[PDB]
Amino acid sequence: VVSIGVFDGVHIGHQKVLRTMKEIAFFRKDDSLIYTISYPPEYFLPDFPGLLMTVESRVEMLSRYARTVVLDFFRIKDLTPEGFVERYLSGVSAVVVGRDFRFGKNASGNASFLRKKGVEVYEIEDVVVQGKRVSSSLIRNLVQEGRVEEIPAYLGRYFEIEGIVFPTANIDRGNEKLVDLKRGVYLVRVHLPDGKKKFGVMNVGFRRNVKYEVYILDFEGDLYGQRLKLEVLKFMRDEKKEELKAAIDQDVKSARNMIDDIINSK
Amino acid sequence: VVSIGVFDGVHIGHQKVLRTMKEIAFFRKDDSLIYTISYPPEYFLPDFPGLLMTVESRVEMLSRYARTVVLDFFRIKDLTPEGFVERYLSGVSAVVVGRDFRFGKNASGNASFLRKKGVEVYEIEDVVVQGKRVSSSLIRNLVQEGRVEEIPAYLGRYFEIEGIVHFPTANIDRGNEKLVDLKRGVYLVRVHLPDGKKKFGVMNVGFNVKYEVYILDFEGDLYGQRLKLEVLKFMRDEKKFDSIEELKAAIDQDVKSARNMIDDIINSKF
Numbered sequence: 250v251v252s253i254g255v256f257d258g259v260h261i262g263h264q265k266v267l268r269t270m271k272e273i274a275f276f277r278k279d280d281s282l283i284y285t286i287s288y289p290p291e292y293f294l295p296d297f298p299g300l301l302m303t304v305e306s307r308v309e310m311l312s313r314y315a316r317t318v319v320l321d322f323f324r325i326k327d328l329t330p331e332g333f334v335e336r337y338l339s340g341v342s343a344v345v346v347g348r349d350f351r352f353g354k355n356a357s358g359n360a361s362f363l364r365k366k367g368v369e370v371y372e373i374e375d376v377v378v379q380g381k382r383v384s385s386s387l388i389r390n391l392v393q394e395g396r397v398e399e400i401p402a403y404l405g406r407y408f409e410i411e412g413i414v415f416p417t418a419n420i421d422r423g424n425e426k427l428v429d430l431k432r433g434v435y436l437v438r439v440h441l442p443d444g445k446k447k448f449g450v451m452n453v454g455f456r457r458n459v460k461y462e463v464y465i466l467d468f469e470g471d472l473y474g475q476r477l478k479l480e481v482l483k484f485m486r487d488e489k490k491e492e493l494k495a496a497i498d499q500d501v502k503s504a505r506n507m508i509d510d511i512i513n514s515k
Numbered sequence: 516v517v518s519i520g521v522f523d524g525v526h527i528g529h530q531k532v533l534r535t536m537k538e539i540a541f542f543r544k545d546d547s548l549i550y551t552i553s554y555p556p557e558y559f560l561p562d563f564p565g566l567l568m569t570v571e572s573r574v575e576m577l578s579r580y581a582r583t584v585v586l587d588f589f590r591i592k593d594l595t596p597e598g599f600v601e602r603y604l605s606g607v608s609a610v611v612v613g614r615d616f617r618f619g620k621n622a623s624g625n626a627s628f629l630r631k632k633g634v635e636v637y638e639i640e641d642v643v644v645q646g647k648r649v650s651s652s653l654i655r656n657l658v659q660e661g662r663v664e665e666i667p668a669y670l671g672r673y674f675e676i677e678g679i680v681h682f683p684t685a686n687i688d689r690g691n692e693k694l695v696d697l698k699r700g701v702y703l704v705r706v707h708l709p710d711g712k713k714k715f716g717v718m719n720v721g722f723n724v725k726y727e728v729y730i731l732d733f734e735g736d737l738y739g740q741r742l743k744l745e746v747l748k749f750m751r752d753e754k755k756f757d758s759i760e761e762l763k764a765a766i767d768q769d770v771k772s773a774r775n776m777i778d779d780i781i782n783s784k785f
């Protein structure tokens with residue numbers, strides 16, 4: 250059985266699709282395979298907020314559910330529904346997709362089409378949270394609006410910023426078009442390159458090209474060319490205007506305080 | 516520093532006015548303030564095409580450049596120039612306005628009256644695009660001719676139909692404001708849903724004027740919900756259909772035609 254989709258973020262609606270695939274495969278006595286289309290079509294348009302994560306991180310999460318195969322957007326956008334089925338679905342009896350699934354040139358292929366070709370299509374209903382349908386777009390907007398505390402309810406976890414490399418650390422996220430947080434300062438949970446978990450204050454600013462710098466707390470080693478994962482816990486304050494230290498000093502007090510509070514709640 | 520004008524649409528010319536204000540504010544280590552006049556005098560005269568957007572939308576765009584304040588055209592058209600300066604410009608050493616700037620009783624107030632009061636005034640030359648001077652009036656006319664594809668070079672973005680939601684087609688209620696109407700017909704649109712989701716739609720403009728949109732690859736009730744729609748292309752003229760079957764034919768072709776254009780847009784990227 251094969252589920253097909255982008256699964257950007259692998260949010261709770263996506264997990265819904267993937268768990269249903271596994272169950273479907275169980276009762277069908279078939280193997281499970283996930284086809285993840287590298288980029289949604291909107292990805293190439295100017296106003297695209299950006300992906301929640303890299304295709305690589307994504308595959309790494311999809312992989313926790315089943316064999317995951319990346320369908321390369323450039324390699325499929327021009328295929329006919331038939332061409333698509335023949336090349337990626339030969340010998341596939343069932344595909345699990347979200348509602349209004351589309352494929353092939355001019356989004357001409359749909360669940361109906363797949364059915365007329367003998368493939369049975371399980372169309373999973375979107376998960377709704379707080380009267381809202383879970384989806385990459387919705388989550389992508391919260392990231393842009395800096396509403397990072399509201400994300401877990403839709404994403405299934407905290408939005409994460411990842412990459413390589415008072416002092417502060419510059420997180421290069423890669424050449425991928427990823428969504429950017431609202432300019433500003435955040436309280437983040439920093440996963441270190443050794444199971445170490447610390448807290449940091451993160452600034453997101455320009456120079457067009459949003460930057461992500463993080464001041465880790467109770468840390469002092471050289472992280473340079475090392476990877477870094479940061480759970481974005483809360484939006485502290487909007488971006489601001491050499492009294493810099495003064496403000497970037499209260500941020501740390503604010504950090505310690507929030508941190509101290511989480512702890513108090515035994 | 517203060518900027519003053521109607522700014523219907525916040526087109527690129529308006530944007531040149533506003534950015535200039537911010538550059539001057541930065542230069543002087545001062546604050547910016549935008550005064551947007553509710554309506555141009557034409558809004559109350561014969562044959563006004565209508566605004567490009569509501570004051571409410573306008574102030575939302577304006578507010579991203581700086582603290583904004585609306586001025587009732589009626590609460591100021593009667594004021595004498597002096598009065599205007601007396602009520603709105605105290606302490607202000609710089610104003611940035613477009614060309615043909617006017618204010619006060621019988622449009623007697625101008626940049627000259629303002630410069631002669633110690634207030635420096637910077638009139639920004641209209642922006643020229645494709646040999647034409649960018650103006651709200653010019654854009655209103657394109658919308659009217661449905662020439663929606665040529666709009667962004669002037670407006671700086673696609674024209675928008677915005678409103679409350681009144682096969683299935685979502686009915687957009689634009690509000691009670693006097694808005695410019697698109698040339699009746701069928702358009703391909705980019706629908707911005709509440710979630711923050713973007714789909715494409717096929718919009719129909721009929722005949723007041725009716726705005727109907729069928730959102731593609733979408734299922735859901737949208738009553739009382741606000742939709743913003745970028746009008747991307749004019750697909751075809753309105754067309755009468757005697758038999759009701761010829762309609763579905765066309766409707767079907769429309770969604771189809773939309774999907775093709777949508778594919779073209781996506782591939783135009785390379």
Ligand SMILES: Nc1ncnc2c1ncn2[C@@H]1O[C@H](COP(=O)(O)OP(=O)(O)O)[C@@H](O)[C@H]1O
Nearest residue numbers: 416417418419463464465468469470471472473
């Ligand atoms: N407490 C810390 N928090 C973040 N980075 C640190 C810390 N201590 C040392 N570093 C390291 O210091 C370097 C950042 O150096 P610096 O030039 O001072 O700042 P930046 O490059 O962000 O402008 C990185 O390689 C980073 O891994």
Ligand SMILES: Nc1ncnc2c1ncn2[C@@H]1O[C@H](COP(=O)(O)OP(=O)(O)O)[C@@H](O)[C@H]1O
Nearest residue numbers: 683684685686728729730733734735736737738
């Ligand atoms: N794909 C869609 N496009 C437009 N509206 C849709 C779509 N799917 C569901 N709807 C919903 O259907 C309703 C439109 O209903 P209907 O009365 O049949 O349309 P109309 O009278 O304008 O032809 C709205 O509540 C709308 O949100």
